[model samples]
Target: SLVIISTLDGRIAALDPENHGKKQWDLDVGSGSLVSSSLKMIIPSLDGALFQWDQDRESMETVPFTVESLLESDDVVLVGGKSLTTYGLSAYSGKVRYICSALGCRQWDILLLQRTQKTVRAVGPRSGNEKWNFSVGHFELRYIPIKVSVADWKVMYQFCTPIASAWLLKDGKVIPISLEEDIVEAARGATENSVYLGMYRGQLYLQSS
Candidate 1:
């Protein structure tokens, strides 16, 4: 179990299962901004460094990798900034690991990269990685890319603009999914093969297989 307590300012404090006041970890993330995910514990400080905390040691480690910069995350962790770099913390050690650079464009919002039995797929900024030049949805406003698992990868969804609908990408193609209401913050997938997307109208939805 994880306990999250946000200060009046933008800093966040996380407590482990004990729920004591020892401050398992804390980040002065600034005021008015959100972080990635506790799963990886990505702290995007105003100082412009992505600090991945080591929960075991109760300390923070700064990532040497830098970028034009933004706050973003995938199923695992936040890969912030204009640099399309895959970032994560070791599930066992909570040590920060910077995966390969996207080599295309930097994704601005929530980035989702998931690995399945047959293939590995990602949806986000298509700018940094040169190999992903053909991948669509770069330089678009509020347009988040999503990938889904079919027998293989498919671009199951692509919401080019902020809208009421959601997208899933599989096999490098986009497919739209309808919702009862307009989504509010960026949408995200859950560990249970379900998606919980908040609506702009203050409603949250869960989509399951």
Candidate 2:
């Protein structure tokens, strides 16, 4: 089996399941975006910049589109081609916001990173009538905490999400990081400055932080 891990510095690595989980190979995964996958891995682009990974061949293919993150058990893919209405000028914002229906939000498997804390907000863009019209939408941040110990002050804090997301806090700035599947155990050496993750597949993703 092959284990894939990515880092804040835009690096991607494949670790051998055997031989003490040594690095079999590695390459640049530009942009440092979080990664997730079902059978094949994907690097989320800020746009149509997505790339697909093939571990056995150690290759990547450009697939400019969005995808829904699935469980390893959801082997059968269901694609519901979608459409939407543009709300207009003020509706466009500079900071890329992963906004969508609160009901259908799972379609993108969106992940956001923060250093200790971050602010998220919502607004009403449309109203049906001047008489009395309002739509109720709520927002919140959900997370789990993890501990890290690095040899030198090289890498500071590392945060691991329950499922597809992970985080690195260097110099108090949060950088998004990842694992492709459900992470079972996550540890970084205070002495080695390396990260070792044990996923549900029973494979180890070992790498020098």
Candidate 3:
């Protein structure tokens, strides 16, 4: 519905989705990355300046903050680059924490590590705590989530992803590699040692009781 763009020489413009013509404001505040916000338009330049423009574009303000790469996820705005020294600062409550701990430390050790340029982390935007640093070098990471109440979706278990490099069990044994469907379920012999766990996904048809 709304589109924003920036020029190499430094100009901010808003283009209407319906038409290619400009809607309002093509203001210049130096070359910067534009981040779209539901409430406002944010423009950040490597020069350490931050601009938040009103939705109407008729009003805007700038703050002195060095920004090199701007990221906007819902209500939280994340900035990156060598200029971002305070990575864990909260924008909502104004509290700060060492994001390194929340993020599994990533590549930041404050010393026993090199590369101050980054310590990529994911955090709850509202709480701004428990941010986990999950960067493990040049490789990329991603995941899919499981839905609990979906009947059409298939359910699965085990990881020998096969996460076999180091696997284990309660009986001092190790399970290794690939899909392990050898799960033990149901009770027998009216008495025995017990091991518990896992959601067994079974389809429930309407009024099948």
Candidate 4:
């Protein structure tokens, strides 16, 4: 087994848990750090610089740009910042693959939806982009974009505001769905086939993919 520990002073260490806690590797992540991890990759945000460490390579490399939020899917890593800029990078090589800049993206405002093994869909407060572009219309987004469900090649997103709205994306198209009440909270199922939404008047809505 392997043991991974992140220190308060921006260090991450991989230890061989069975070998008397022998250190396998370590790196200085950065100051004012935020770290995100997958089974084989560790992504750290230090101030504005983003870095990724590959357990396979036993190396750490800086991503070419700065980001405020980071998310990864099967083959791509998504990075975003306050200026509504987003970047898609190759998962294994950390190479720039795509970029998108739209309106009103804050930290935590981006969600990556895996459309297929090779296709990724990015849903943000004001825009959606992958190989193509989809618009979520003009509105002042008040909260981070949240996925409510996914089904039949479609992804559902719940946008937060006083008069909240929901939209579904499929085949590069955005379909707006009207809700009976304002959405207070929404989340996808752990197993990927269902979704739950909470309304302002204590109503819970459930949908199955």
Candidate 5:
């Protein structure tokens, strides 16, 4: 369960998902706080260091990784800033594997959102990563996957501000579906073959095509 850590006047608190109350885990890192929780581990980032709370051991230890951004995947964690890094999880301990290093591609903005199964679509900044940037503008990517099946994934929301587009990935290539309508946010797997979308003016749309 992912938790959000909020700091108020130098006091750090953990928000309980159950009661929406504050359950304090007293750790002070005088700047920013980032809470990332997976089924196995809870990683909190504060100040400039990363710390992991070992539930079994009942302890918090400093994680030896320095990055501008990091996110958790199913069994692996992706960390990056100017570049990218992928680290696998230890099957035995549920702890992050120490086998981490920097990736080559730099000068890219990578957004790793929730995905369907073992796949995710990453949208990157303009003029970075040849495969990601094809022009001077930002590169939009959608990982089209048919085997994973649309039935397996759910849609929580969509975009409408700058463009009305449905993003997906198929066969390792990004597919962009344009919508004449505005943004649409939907619940996960709303229908058999169709999905729901939220509109710009607070409306709902059930789209199949």
Candidate 6:
């Protein structure tokens, strides 16, 4: 398997874990900083510049974007910036596929939302074509441990920090499911039938619908 690591000064190294962590390749994407990583790539917050490693080329390529945070699904990379712009980039080619401007947006399964704030959108992961969008009430988007899922053409999210609530969107309606605990983290299992919520006080709550 491929192992990737990044340093504070913007050096990224790809290693072969099976071969006793042998360094396969290394590069300097920029002078900014490394922010996030995935099985395929490492993303650096380049102070308005984006860099992605091309596995085939064994090199890092620059994309024109400045982002605050990064998230990844199977084949797409999602990026959110302070300008409230969220971009979807091709995981393999590091190409910009789609862009969304909302209150705050991040990847949620095949869907994207403006965090705990008001807005949700559906897009084609490969084509970057928008499928649909909707609005919601004002709420603060949590920084860490936000959970989202898509099932049966419906979207659900669990909010941790600031407030704890489980939200569901279906048939042009938004439903808020309130939880009594102060959530610190939230996640959904592979089946999408169960939700796991972690509270600040070290409690785990499992909910099924």
Candidate closest to the true structure, highest lDDT: 6
Question: Per-residue alpha-carbon lDDT of model 3 for 11-112, expressed as tens digits?
Answer: 323333344433443333321322211215443321223455566766645644323323222554453334122233222122223333323633323101
**Candidate 5 local lDDT, 102-144, one digit each (tens):** 4242232211211111111234445333221000011122111
Reference-based lDDT, residue 137, model 6: 22
Clashing pairs in 6: 104-114
TM-scores for all predictions: 0.19, 0.21, 0.19, 0.19, 0.19, 0.20
Question: Judged by lDDT against the true structure, how good is candidate 6?
Answer: 0.32
Regions more than 4 Å wrong, model 5: 1-40, 69-79, 82-209
Q: lDDT by residue for model 4 over 1-209, one digit each (tens)? A: 33333322233333433455455444332222222222143232222343455668876555553333233324333433332234332322223344435534333222121110011134443344333211111111111122222222112211121222233333434344432233323333233433222222222112222
Clashes of 1: 39
The candidate 3 region of ten consecutive residues with least summed lDDT is 159-168
Least well predicted 10-residue stretch by lDDT in candidate 5: 130-139
lDDT for position 31 in model 6: 27
Error of 5 at 103 (Å): 23
Model 1: how large is the Cα RMSD against the reference? 21.4
Best by TM-score: 2
Order of quality (lDDT): 6, 4, 2, 1, 5, 3
| Pairwise TM-score winner, candidates 3 and 6 | 6
**In candidate 5, residue 103 scores what lDDT?**
26
Over 1-209, each residue of candidate 6 has an lDDT whose tens digit, in order, gives: 33222222234333433454445444333223222222134333212233555679977565553333222214443433233333443322223344455545444341122212122333556678654332212121111111223221111211122122233333424344332233423333333445332222222112233
- Cα error, residue 53 of model 2, in Å, equals 2.8
User: Runs in model 1 with CA error above 4 Å?
Assistant: 3-14, 25-83, 98-100, 103-209
Error of 2 at 166 (Å): 12
